[PDB]
Amino acid sequence: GTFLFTSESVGEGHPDKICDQISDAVLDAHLQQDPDAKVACETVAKTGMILLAGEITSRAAVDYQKVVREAVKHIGYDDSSKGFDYKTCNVLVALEQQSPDIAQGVHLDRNEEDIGAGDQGLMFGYATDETEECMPLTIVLAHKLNAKLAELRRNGTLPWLRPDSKTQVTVQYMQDRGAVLPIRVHTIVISVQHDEEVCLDEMRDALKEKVIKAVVPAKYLDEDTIYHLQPSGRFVIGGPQGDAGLTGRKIIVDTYGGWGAHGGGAFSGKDYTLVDRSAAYAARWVAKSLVKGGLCRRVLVQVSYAIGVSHPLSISIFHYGTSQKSERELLEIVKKNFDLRPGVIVRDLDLKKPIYQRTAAYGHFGRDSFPWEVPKKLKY
Amino acid sequence: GTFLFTSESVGEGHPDKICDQISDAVLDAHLQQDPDAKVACETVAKTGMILLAGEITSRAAVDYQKVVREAVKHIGYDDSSKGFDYKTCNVLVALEQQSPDIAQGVHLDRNEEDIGAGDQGLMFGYATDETEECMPLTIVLAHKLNAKLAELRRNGTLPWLRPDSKTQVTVQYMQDRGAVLPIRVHTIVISVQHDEEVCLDEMRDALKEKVIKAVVPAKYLDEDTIYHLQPSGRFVIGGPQGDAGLTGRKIIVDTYGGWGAHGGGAFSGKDYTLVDRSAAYAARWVAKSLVKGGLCRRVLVQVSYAIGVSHPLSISIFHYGTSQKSERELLEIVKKNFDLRPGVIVRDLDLKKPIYQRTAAYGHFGRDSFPWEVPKKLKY
Ligand SMILES: Nc1ncnc2c1ncn2[C@@H]1O[C@H](CO)[C@@H](O)[C@H]1O
Numbered sequence: 001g002t003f004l005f006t007s008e009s010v011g012e013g014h015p016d017k018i019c020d021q022i023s024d025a026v027l028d029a030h031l032q033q034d035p036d037a038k039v040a041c042e043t044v045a046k047t048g049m050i051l052l053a054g055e056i057t058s059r060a061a062v063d064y065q066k067v068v069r070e071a072v073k074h075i076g077y078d079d080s081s082k083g084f085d086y087k088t089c090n091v092l093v094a095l096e097q098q099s100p101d102i103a104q105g106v107h108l109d110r111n112e113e114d115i116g117a118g119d120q121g122l123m124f125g126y127a128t129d130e131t132e133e134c135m136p137l138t139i140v141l142a143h144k145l146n147a148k149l150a151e152l153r154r155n156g157t158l159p160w161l162r163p164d165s166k167t168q169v170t171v172q173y174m175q176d177r178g179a180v181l182p183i184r185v186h187t188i189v190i191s192v193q194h195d196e197e198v199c200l201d202e203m204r205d206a207l208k209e210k211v212i213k214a215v216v217p218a219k220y221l222d223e224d225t226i227y228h229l230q231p232s233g234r235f236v237i238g239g240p241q242g243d244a245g246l247t248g249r250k251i252i253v254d255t256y257g258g259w260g261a262h263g264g265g266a267f268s269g270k271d272y273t274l275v276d277r278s279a280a281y282a283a284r285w286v287a288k289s290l291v292k293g294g295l296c297r298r299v300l301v302q303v304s305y306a307i308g309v310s311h312p313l314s315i316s317i318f319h320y321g322t323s324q325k326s327e328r329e330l331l332e333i334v335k336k337n338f339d340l341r342p343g344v345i346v347r348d349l350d351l352k353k354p355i356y357q358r359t360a361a362y363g364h365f366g367r368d369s370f371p372w373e374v375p376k377k378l379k380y
Numbered sequence: 381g382t383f384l385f386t387s388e389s390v391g392e393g394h395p396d397k398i399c400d401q402i403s404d405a406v407l408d409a410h411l412q413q414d415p416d417a418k419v420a421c422e423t424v425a426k427t428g429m430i431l432l433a434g435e436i437t438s439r440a441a442v443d444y445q446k447v448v449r450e451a452v453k454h455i456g457y458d459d460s461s462k463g464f465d466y467k468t469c470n471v472l473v474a475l476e477q478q479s480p481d482i483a484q485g486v487h488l489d490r491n492e493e494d495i496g497a498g499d500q501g502l503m504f505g506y507a508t509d510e511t512e513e514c515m516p517l518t519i520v521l522a523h524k525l526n527a528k529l530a531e532l533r534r535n536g537t538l539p540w541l542r543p544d545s546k547t548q549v550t551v552q553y554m555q556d557r558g559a560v561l562p563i564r565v566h567t568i569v570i571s572v573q574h575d576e577e578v579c580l581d582e583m584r585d586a587l588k589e590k591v592i593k594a595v596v597p598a599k600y601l602d603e604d605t606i607y608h609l610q611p612s613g614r615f616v617i618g619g620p621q622g623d624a625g626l627t628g629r630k631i632i633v634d635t636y637g638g639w640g641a642h643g644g645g646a647f648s649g650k651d652y653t654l655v656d657r658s659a660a661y662a663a664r665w666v667a668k669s670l671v672k673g674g675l676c677r678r679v680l681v682q683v684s685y686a687i688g689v690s691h692p693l694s695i696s697i698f699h700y701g702t703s704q705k706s707e708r709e710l711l712e713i714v715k716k717n718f719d720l721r722p723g724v725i726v727r728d729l730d731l732k733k734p735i736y737q738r739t740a741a742y743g744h745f746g747r748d749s750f751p752w753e754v755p756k757k758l759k760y
Pocket residue numbers: 014015016164165166191192232233234235236237238239242243479481482485499687
């Protein structure tokens with residue numbers, strides 16, 4: 001009755017995550033000046049280059065050079081020896097207004113409450129009672145391993161670390177009436193960029209003693225756990241020099257690590273009218289409210305939209321058999337307690353607030369008591 | 381016992397799909413000259429611009445200007461009146477060699493059979509007996525609606541159509557012992573770019589009579605079906621001018637439309653050593669072989685890898701209760717019949733053949749009898 005499940009995460013300096021953080025830094029900069037900014041900012045990163053591409057309509061005056069470079073500085077790429085330097089990289093901007101055809105169809109002359117969806121699409125929310133934060137253990141551990149690397153890099157415990165890292169965690173689970181119970185960690189992978197001077201054995205020892213053992217509860221680790229630590233043997237070249245980055249290429253790292261489902265939309269760089277983000281946040285909020293409310297132990301929520309239409313086209317609830325109530329009953333409860341119009345979500349989840357850069361690494365869910373992580377008390 | 385499920389698809393000229401097709405055109409061009417080319421080609425599209433970014437190590441001599449422009453020509457963007465023209469757009473190239481640190485860790489001096497994975501990561505395969513091609517009806521219909529638009533555009537039946545389109549299909553399903561049974565189409569969305577001269581009513585009538593009714597079996601369509609046709613009211617600006625495109629931003633459109641699961645990796649622009657693609661193809665192949673072999677009606681397969689390691693780190697089978705055999709038994713059958721090392725997958729699925737551009741629109745699965753769509757006869 002046991003099975004394996006694997007999730008991955010990446011660090012703040014993984015080239016794809018760099019792009020997500022910059023895109024949300026641009027979004028936050030606009031919202032600080034114009035809460036109703038329309039933002040669709042894609043970022044591309046390669047050796048020596050940050051490119052901004054997309055559509056922004058805003059009353060703000062934003063210094064893109066400063067915003068991008070400050071974001072890269074925060075990540076830690078501040079010297080050519082590290083492969084990338086905020087002081088001297090190229091920043092290119094290819095930003096235009098929102099298409100007037102889109103503007104007239106989505107929000108122009110529409111009361112905020114009844115604004116249309118900024119696009120069609122589908123979105124999922126997921127929650128599982130296997131952790132206090134209602135997230136799969138596989139991805140929670142994966143995120144925390146990268147966070148520990150960043151912590152030990154910035155505090156100088158491991159000065160040889162560089163910002164680009166990847167982790168992967170395989171957990172053995174037990175089935176429990178549709179719910180899942182973690183038993184043990186089966187395999188951990190860690191690859192992290194490092195300086196030229198540190199040897200492989202020193203790095204592998206540190207990754208086991210100072211990162212994994214400092215992160216993963218001992219009850220999940222045993223003599224049989226498999227460790228793949230710096231399995232490439234050498235990872236000096238990294239960041240954008242090692243691998244092109246793009247916004248929206250870590251959407252499973254951003255959400256549930258393969259558990260639940262995904263509708264395909266990226267989060268970073270998008271204002272609240274773009275339901276790919278806001279509706280995914282709302283769907284998480286619904287799912288966690290159902291689990292924390294004791295109606296189920298594990299649940300998947302789908303919603304979908306049409307461009308220009310405020311009300312969702314479909315809503316679906318899948319509880320994996322972990323509720324006494326039928327899925328139909330849960331759907332009725334959701335409809336009585338939630339209003340998933342984008343012009344209502346924005347108020348409930350405070351999505352004009354410039355807090356988006358905080359979401360763009362280590363997952364959008366399970367952390368920091370964002371509004372979508374604070375369950376709603378359900379009436380039924 | 382009924383529920384809704386929604387999937388979307390996009391056309392060949394959706395800016396994200398444009399990028400996928402160009403990336404695979406570049407991949408195919410290299411493989412035509414060098415079957416062992418190492419390719420990691422990202423594409424970015426915005427008004428007037430195609431940018432290539434990434435890492436290629438190859439003995440080929442490729443004319444990127446010709447390959448990109450020929451791909452855009454094939455899609456149909458051949459005049460400024462359409463928003464984009466292969467003859468006069470900018471093509472920028474930021475391509476470098478594969479990182480030597482990656483090269484030494486993955487494939488250098490390693491027998492082809494025992495080559496390491498080109499990265500860590502997780503991948504899923506999925507199959508469902510609800511259609512002959514073992515795909516969810518929602519996404520099959522969504523793809524076919526875009527294909528019909530492209531057919532009627534290219535054959536001149538609807539000369540006002542332009543290449544950029546999106547569709548979305550909501551199906552009502554019935555539960556059947558873990559399997560799913562389509563009952564009816566609940567909602568269809570179609571948005572497609574059009575010329576300035578055609579009126580909204582003419583377009584909406586054509587989309588219902590010449591596209592939907594020509595694609596969707598009448599048994600699924602009834603008086604209650606909801607149609608959202610050109611719901612924005614105007615879609616003249618489109619393609620990259622309307623919305624920035626990036627490679628790997630339609631990964632759910634590329635796979636199962638929200639059904640099953642996804643590990644996060646993009647397909648287009650990647651050679652066989654990059655398991656994000658090859659292992660996803662192999663996982664589809666496993667899943668379809670199990671369903672077509674009569675061992676289950678609906679199944680999800682996970683695999684995962686570590687960079688530099690040939691053998692998978694984990695394999696998992698989820699059959700939704702649609703088999704008499706346990707999931708453990710199915711896993712044993714998979715292990716006896718499949719070898720999921722990347723240096724074996726390449727031989728079984730012929731992944732050095734330059735056929736990748738054919739996969740980059742209308743989904744990678746359920747079509748064209750690619751090698752991963754031809755089930756393996758299982759011994760057990
Ligand atoms: N030499 C290497 N060893 C391990 N991981 C690497 C190496 N070079 C790059 N990576 C990571 O793998 C990703 C994909 O190549 C990169 O973005 C980086 O995070």
